Structures are given as C-alpha cells and as structure tokens.
Amino acid sequence: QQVRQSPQSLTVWEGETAILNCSYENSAFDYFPWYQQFPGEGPALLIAIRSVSDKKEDGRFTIFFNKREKKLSLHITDSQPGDSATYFCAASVTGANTGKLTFGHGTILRVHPNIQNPDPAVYQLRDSKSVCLFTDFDSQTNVSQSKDSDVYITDKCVLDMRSMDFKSNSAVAWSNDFACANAFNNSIIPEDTFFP
Amino acid sequence: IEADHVGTYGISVYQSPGDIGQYTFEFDGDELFYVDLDKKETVWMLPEFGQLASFDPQGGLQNIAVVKHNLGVLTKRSNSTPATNEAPQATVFPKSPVLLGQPNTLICFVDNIFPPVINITWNSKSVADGVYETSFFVNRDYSFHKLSYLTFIPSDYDCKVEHWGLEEPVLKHW
Amino acid sequence: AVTQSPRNKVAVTGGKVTLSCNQTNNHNNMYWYRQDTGHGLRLIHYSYGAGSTEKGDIPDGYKASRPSQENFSLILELATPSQTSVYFCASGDFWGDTLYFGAGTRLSVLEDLKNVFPPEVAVFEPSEAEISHTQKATLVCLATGFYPDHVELSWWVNGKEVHSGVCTDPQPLKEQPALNDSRYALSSRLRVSATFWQNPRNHFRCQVQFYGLSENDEWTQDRAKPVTQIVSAEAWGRA
Amino acid sequence: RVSYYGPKTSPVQERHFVYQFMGECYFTNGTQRIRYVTRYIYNREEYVRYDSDVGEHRAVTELGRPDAEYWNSQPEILERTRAELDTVCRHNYEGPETHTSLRRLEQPNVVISLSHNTLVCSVTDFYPAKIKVRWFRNGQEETVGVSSTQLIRNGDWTFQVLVMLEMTPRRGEVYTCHVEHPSLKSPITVEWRA
Secondary structure: OOEEEEOOEEEEEOOOOEEEEEEEOOOOOOEEEEEEEOOOOOOEEEEEEEOOOOEEEEOOEEEEEEOOOOEEEEEEOOOOHHHOEEEEEEEEOHHHOOOOOEEOOOEEEEEEOOOOOOOOEEEEOEOOOEEEEEEOOOOOOOOOOOOOOOEEEEOOOEEOOOOOOOOOOOEEEEEOOOOOOOOOOOOOOOOOOEOO | OOOOEEEEEEEEEEEEOOOEEEEEEEEOOEEEEEEEOOOOEEEEOOHHHHOOOEOOOHHHHHHHHHHHHHHHHHHHHOOOOOOOOOOOEEEEEEOOOOOOOOOEEEEEEEEEEOOOOOEEEOOOOOOOOOEEEOOOEEOOOOOEEEEEEEEEOOOOOEEEEEOOOOOOOEEEEO | OEEEEOOEEEEEOOOOEEEEEEEOOOOOEEEEEEEEOOOEEEEEEEEOOOOOOEEOOOOOOOEEEEEEOOEEEEEEOOOOHHHOEEEEEEEEOOOOOOOEEOOOEEEEEEOOOOOOOOOEEEEEEOOHHHHHHHOEEEEEEEEEEEOOOOEEEEEEEOOEEEOOOEEEOOOOEEOOOOOOOOOEEEEEEEEEEHHHHHOOOOEEEEEEEEOOEOOOOOOOOOOOOOEOEEEEEEEEOOO | OOEOOOOOOOOOOOOOEEEEEEEEEEEEOOOOEEEEEEEEEEOOEEEEEEEOOOOEEEEOOOOOHHHHHHHHHOHHHHHHHHHHHHHHHHHHHHHHHHHOHHHOOEOOEEEEEEOOEEEEEEEEEEEOOOOEEEEEEOOEEEOOOEEEOOOEEOOOOOEEEEEEEEEOOOOOOEEEEEEEOOOOOOOEEEEEEO
C-alpha cells in the first residue's frame, strides 16, 4: 500500500524530457493523481490517471500507467525551468469510499535554464566574509560541496517564477586561507575555466 | 423484481432531529454488518464473516455525511413537511423448541417501523440482562423492522414497544 | 479558497498551539497534513462534516475540531520538538478527485527561546572581471545566522521589487551541521546588465523577511527580542 | 483479504424528518444477469431512483426532478453510478459473497414430539432457505392433515420450520419426519414409534 517514487532528486537542462517514476504495492489502487508543489506554496493537482486507462496526455505532461507491473511514470517534455518543483505520486482505492489518498514521498525536479554560450568563470565579488561566484558552466559540471566546514557552497538556486530576462544557474561560495582559485577544489571543474 | 439473490448494499439512513444514522449491508434479507458510527467500527452479524471478508468503516462514515447533507436540503425543499408516524406490530416466538431446564432464545419481531426510533423492552417487571437488538431492516415499503432477542431459562414473558405512532405502549405477551 | 492561519509560528515545548483552516468552496471534507523531509505528506486528522473528525495515519499528539463546514482546526495541547514541521490543510468535495491545499504554515517548537536570532544581511557588488568579461553583473546577497529557517528573500531595484535575473536557494542551510541548534544561512543572486549597473543612480537592495516572536511573547535575555522583522542590505551602482 | 464495496450516495445541491438511500443488486444465474437499482427516499416516499435498465436517473416524485436532472448532466457521476453495477454488485457477488454468504451451509436439527393427537416436527437453525419436510406413516407419505408454518426468519442467518401432522397413535405405528436440504448429503429421517 506504500507508494514508492524514484529518483529522489532529478536535475535536467531546459528542453530535456523528465521521467518521474512511481510504483505501488496494493493491487486495489485504481486512481493515481500527481500533485505539483512549488517552493513556498502547497501542492496542487497536476494530472491524474485511472486504472482502466493506459496513458493520459495533457500538454507537456503525460502519465504512463502499467497495471501488470504496478508501475507509473510522469513524463515532462520540453522541460521549462518553471517546472522546477516537488512532484508527488498518490493513489486511492476509490471503491473503499474513504476519501484518503496515499502519497509518495515526492521527487524534487530542478530544471536548469539553458545557456546560449557557455563561459565558465569564477569571480570575486566585493564586500561593502568574501564571496566567490562560479557561473556560466554547461551540462557536464557537477558542483560538489566543500570538504571544509567554514566554507559554504550553494549549488542549486531556483529562479524566481517571474524572471523574464537574466536566467543563470550559478553557485556561490563564502568563508573566512580562502581565495576563489581554490574555493571549488572538491568539485569537477572544466579545464578552460576563467580565473581573473 | 425477480432474482435468485439480492444484495442490498450501502443502506444509509439519517434522521433529524437527534442526528441518528445507520449504515448496513444485507444479503438475501440478512444483515451482513453495520458500521458503528461512534466506535467507527465495522461490526459483523456473524464474527465468522469478519474473519473471511472486510469492509472499511470509513466508507460508511462518508456516506452518512452525504445523507446527513441531503437530508438538510430536502427538509427545506419540500417546505419542511414532517415525517408521518406508523403503528408497529410485534410477534414473539422462540429460536429453538422450548425445554424447561434448558437455555432458550426468545425473539421479538417488530415491523411497520417508521421513523426508526423505538424502545423495545420486556414477570411483570423490566428485564435488561442478556438482550441483543438487531439493526433496522429494510422493507419494500420503506418502513423498517427490527428483532430483539432475550435469553431465557424456560420456566413456568411479554414484549413491550414504545413508538410514536402508538398512543400507549403495546405489550405482546407470551 | 483555502487559507490557513497563522502562516508562521514559534513555540516552546509544553505550550498549546492552534493551527486554523478556513475554506470557501462549500467543500465537505477537510484534511490536516504535515510535511517533513524523508516522510512526504502524512495525514494527521480529517473530517467529513461539522461535528465529526477522523484519525489520520499519525494522529498522536494533536487533536482536531471541525465546528463548521468552512472551518477545521488542528490543536497541539502539549507542543513537542518533534512536532516542528510545515503543516498543510486541504479540502475536497464528496467523492472528489481533487484535493485543494493551503499555502502552509511553518512551525518551530523549541526547547528554549534562547537560540532564536534574526538574520545578518549583506550585499556583494559584482566583480569588474565579470562585467568586462560578460557585459553582465551579478549581485550576491547573503543572509546568515538566523533561526529558525522561516525566512523569505527579495530583491528591490530602485523602489520596485524585481524578479527578472533573480535566483535564490529554495531552502536555507546549516552553518554548523554537527550542532542540533545550528543557525541557518540563505543566499541569492541578482543578475543585471553591465550598462544598468554602472549607472550610479540605480540602487539595489536585498530585503529579507524573518519571522520570529510576536508582540505578546516573552523575552528573557538582554539582547533585542527577535521580533518578526525585515533586514535589508544596500548597494549603489558605480563607474 | 477480499472486500465489500458500497455505492456512493450521490449528493444534492417534535417534527421529524427521514432520509434513506439504498443500492439493490439483483443477481440471476450467479452474475449472468445483474440488475442494479439505487434509491433515494425522503420520509418513506421514494423520490429519486437510478435503474440500470433505464441507464440513467429518473425522478419518481416531483421532488426528484432537480437531482435526477442534475446527476444526469455531470458524467463523473452518471458514468460512475452506471459502473457501480460492476464495481459494487459484480465485485461483491464474485468476491466477498462467494467467500461468505454463498458458502454458508448449516444443517437443521429435527426433533419430533407429541403435542386423536398431533405430532410436531421441529426443524431449526439452518441455512439457506431451501428445505423440504415430508411426513411418513409406516412408510407411506402422509399429505392429508399435515400443516406447516411458513419459513420463519431468525435474524441470525438461520431459518426454522415446524410441520404439524394430525394423527392417532396406535401402539406399533412408526411416523417418520423426512428432511431434505442442500447441506445434507443424505436426507435426515427421524422416527417416532407409537
């Protein structure tokens, strides 16, 4: 009866297709609604399928249901960064007339905005602690956190829902032997990365 | 309507004032179970069936909600016409052949019940030890019937009903 | 519409909290959920109508009350640290395919009110390296040392709040993850053109809303009582 | 286990008042032919009804037109109720009932006893309701002077019947009460020697 969703976090670049998977154990589940939760609000119904149904289309969102394998998938095509949210799988036995829905633990989907020309660089910002900005890097970079406490690195911001004009996915490091040349020592940097 | 069997499923009954409700299943005339709306518990007529099937009591609760709701609306829709009472009839008979010095069960069968609130009691003096009432059953005419059970040690009894559609209580002696 | 009150609340063990939820869709069922990482969305209590109330999957420590079709309340008579969470209220019709959720309430229940600090806030001006290299400029705002993590960041550009070019962390971060009372930090960035930044008539401000104690609360230290407040940091475009 | 599913009561948008709702499934030849009929009753007067023969709600008194008209419009409700013939009736007959009501068999207890006299054959505590009870006198079926109660319903999933034969006991005669029922491999025969 437990609902089990995979993966726990998915990260995608704009334009990809996201695959969020969900499986259940109770064979009596016959209604499977997906709820989308944006940061700071509470979940709203995204899209739902019944068991007598093989597929449910709705714009860029589609549910694929497989009764035999008790498996279920949400595809998001043309992933817009505005789709960055937590997505929950749910299921009720509608015949039991009980009104309670069983909920997955949800997968966090962060969509990356797309870069017209990558230009990896690490800049030093001015204080008015001092901060280092790693920015403009392409799909083949994963920012790992610091091997040192006392050095803080934030990797995945979320764009304001209303941003129209200057969307990027930078990383910020700060601390109190700390310079920006070494700041991202513990993560995988492109070889031709700018260091002014 | 002709058939081999009839299952009468999801019988919801609500009455105001008093906020009195009942949710039962029946098969072929016999009560499978009711939902206890206070303990929120499905209680089966035969425990053996409870060990062989199940019913989530919550689907009863939700249905009673609906039926409470509907009752509010129709009450008003008809400009608040009230329920019209009925005269119930009781018939007392024993479960097994009666044998003094042998325990026996004595059944009281009340019918033409509407609305479904009755007091069904019983030497010349009231008796309360070892009685089981049934839940209200459904008649083709939308009045109800109900059976009460008294356990006696046959020796050498009357069944008393107090309804509203009866001016003075009716006692059917044995 | 489905609204909950209060939206943020601080409380100490042993106190009695009351979350309240109101709904105007003439819905008949109402629910009280709870959200925590590693646990998804758990049902505490719910109700099919006025007067009735059902025990969800984790009803221990809370009691609920549905006095009216439009009203469902969720009460913690003896608040516990373990009841620190984000609470969501919902509603639905009879046999409804959809649940309709509220905007949530953050609640922190703490062993002591000593460790409730507001954030210290700073704006960091863009590097000239990034400007000359990108004809783009990125301000970085840091909010540090607050507790609990009930915070909301905003960028203000010459008196109007701005949204384009803004990305901030979706959840704060523990300064000392070893400690159980660790304070938190949030970061944000605002990217503008370089032509826009170098005009020293444009000012840029990072405003962070912190929710803490209230008027009627009781503070027993010399420090200023961490009222619910706004902290701001500012910077001016330059040459 | 296997589970009973009930219909969904459709909702609508001293002096006492009564509401009642029921779902009737009518099975003939197992599930070979099912009829599904659902009824909404206010103050003992039925006012709305769905019936799978009609395939759609109908008002039965003029209180009912609002609801029958309404429920017929919104297909999430009408299709659901139409499908309750399978999701409720067929599901319940084929599932829980087969494990319970349809598998129950309790055989009856038979005792004869004298009351120109009359013997009474007391046949009690059996299920289901099908039963034949015949008298024999010295081995000859006695159909004259024999009179039985109707099937008496005990309320606890058991029936009883009592068959009185008018007789005159002459020392030597054998009267046998003869009981056939689906629960008995061979019939039950209980004798009373005069």
